Amino acid sequence: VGDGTTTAAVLSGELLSKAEELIMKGVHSTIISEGYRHAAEKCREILETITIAISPDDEAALIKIAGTAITGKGAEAYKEKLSALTVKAVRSIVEEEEDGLKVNVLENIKIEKRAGGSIDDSELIDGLVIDKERSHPNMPEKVENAKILLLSCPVEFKMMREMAEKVIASGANVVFCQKGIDDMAQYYIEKAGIYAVRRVKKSDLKRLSKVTGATIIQDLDQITTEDVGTAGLVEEKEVRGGKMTYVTGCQNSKAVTVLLHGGTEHVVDSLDHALNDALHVVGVVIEDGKVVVGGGSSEVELSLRLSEYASTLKGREQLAVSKFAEALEVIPVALAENAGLDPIDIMVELRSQHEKGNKNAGLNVYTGEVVDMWENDVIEPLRIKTQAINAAMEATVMILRI
296 backbone φψ class: left, alpha, beta (φ>0; ψ -120 to 50): left
CA distance 118 to 60: 23
Radius of gyration of the chain (CA): 28
Q: DSSP characters for 42-58?
A: HHHHHHHHHPEE--TT-
- Report how far Cα 53 is from the mean position of its chain's Cα atoms: 19
CA distance 162 to 139: 20
CB proximity list for 68: less than 8 A, separation 6 or greater:
281, 377, 378, 379
Cβ-contact 307, 328 below 8 angstroms: no
- Report how far Cα 290 is from the mean position of its chain's Cα atoms: 15
CA distance 361 to 377: 12
What kind of architecture, by CATH, is found in domain 127-253?
3-Layer(bba) Sandwich (3.50)
Q: Which class does domain 1-53+291-402 fall in? A: mainly alpha
CA distance 341 to 335: 8
Query: What does the angle CA 266 – CA 128 – CA 250 come to, to the nearest 5 degrees?
Result: 170
The residue extents of the domains of the chain are 1-53+291-402, 54-126+254-290, 127-253
CA distance 260 to 126: 14
137 backbone φψ class: left, alpha, beta (φ>0; ψ -120 to 50): alpha
Q: How many residues are recorded in the chain? A: 402
Deposited resolution, Å:
2.7
β strands within 198-289, DSSP E: 229-238, 243-250, 256-262
Q: Which amino acid is at 152?
A: S
Question: Can you give the chain as a three-state secondary structure string?
Answer: CCHHHHHHHHHHHHHHHHHHHHHCCCCCHHHHHHHHHHHHHHHHHHHHHHCEECCCCCHHHHHHHHHCCCCCCCCCCCHHHHHHHHHHHHCCCEECCCCCCEECHHHHEEEEEEECCCHHHCEEECEEEECCCCCCCCCCCEEEEEEEEEECCCECCCHHHHHHHHHHCCCCCEEEECCCECHHHHHHHHHCCCEEECCCCHHHHHHHHHHHCCCCECCCCCCCCCCCEEEEEEEEEECCCCEEEEEEEECCCCCEEEEEEECCHHHHHHHHHHHHHHHHHHHHHHHHCEEEECCCHHHHHHHHHHHHHHHCCCCHHHHHHHHHHHHCCHHHHHHHHHCCCCHHHHHHHHHHHHHCCCCCEEECCCCCCEEECCCCCCEEEHHHHHHHHHHHHHHHHHHHCC
Q: Place domain 54-126+254-290 in its CATH homologous superfamily.
A: TCP-1-like chaperonin intermediate domain (3.30.260.10)
Cβ-contact 135, 178 below 8 angstroms: no
Q: Method of determination?
A: X-ray
β strands within 251-360, DSSP E: 256-262, 290-293
Residue 402, SS3 per DSSP: coil
Cβ-contact 284, 381 below 8 angstroms: yes
Cβ-contact 12, 19 below 8 angstroms: no
Q: Which residues does a chain break follow in the chain (C to N more than 2.5 Å)?
A: 157
196 backbone φψ class: left, alpha, beta (φ>0; ψ -120 to 50): beta
CA distance 390 to 214: 41
Alpha helix segments (H runs only) across 169-264:
183-191, 202-212
CA 100 to each of CA 20, 47, 103: distance values in angstroms, whole numbers, following the listed order? 41, 18, 10
Q: Which amino acid is at 147?
A: K
Quick one: which of 24, 13, 31 has its CA closest to 319? 31
Q: Do domains 54-126+254-290 and 127-253 have the same CATH topology?
A: no
